[PDB]
Amino acid sequence: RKAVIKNADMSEEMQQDAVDCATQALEKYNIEKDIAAYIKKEFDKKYNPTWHCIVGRNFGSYVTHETRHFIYFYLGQVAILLFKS
Amino acid sequence: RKAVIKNADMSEEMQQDAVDCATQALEKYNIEKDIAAYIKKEFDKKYNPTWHCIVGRNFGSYVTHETRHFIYFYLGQVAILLFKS
């Protein structure tokens, strides 16, 4: 439900898309792996490969991302990391 | 800390290196992001860039990894994802 963007190196539009896409994922799936899959495949579909997605309530990360292709946000009580290498 | 390899596309001793490195990280740092940072940076160093690391107790992922460069394992009470894009 409640979206909160924590760090974003990404356009305001593609950010809002990431939120809308993740909302679709949560509507359809309950398992974090499936949610991440949904988001990753959709972003690979609409903005070209290669994307990677992490969905969870407890994790830390350290990744190397492409300029303008990184976002990290909460949506309800789940955190979402989505990025191109 | 019990080490359990869940999914690995990676050589025997590189896998062992992931465990050893993760062990050193857990001894020094308590924050998942910092732990993730430690592992990532050391794999950049020894095996060339570019690696990404996720450490946590609760997450799912869906990532695309270069061949022979993917490990997912538990070390004690955390799960660790480490991979080249």
């Binding site: 309530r57 994790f59 990360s61 350290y62 990744v63 991302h65 300029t67 | 992001k33």
Partner: peptide, 10 residues
């Protein structure tokens, strides 16, 4: 290309 860390609980 850049690098950045993330951390979550709750």
């Amino acid at each position: 290309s850049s690098t950045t860390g993330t951390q979550c609980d709750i």
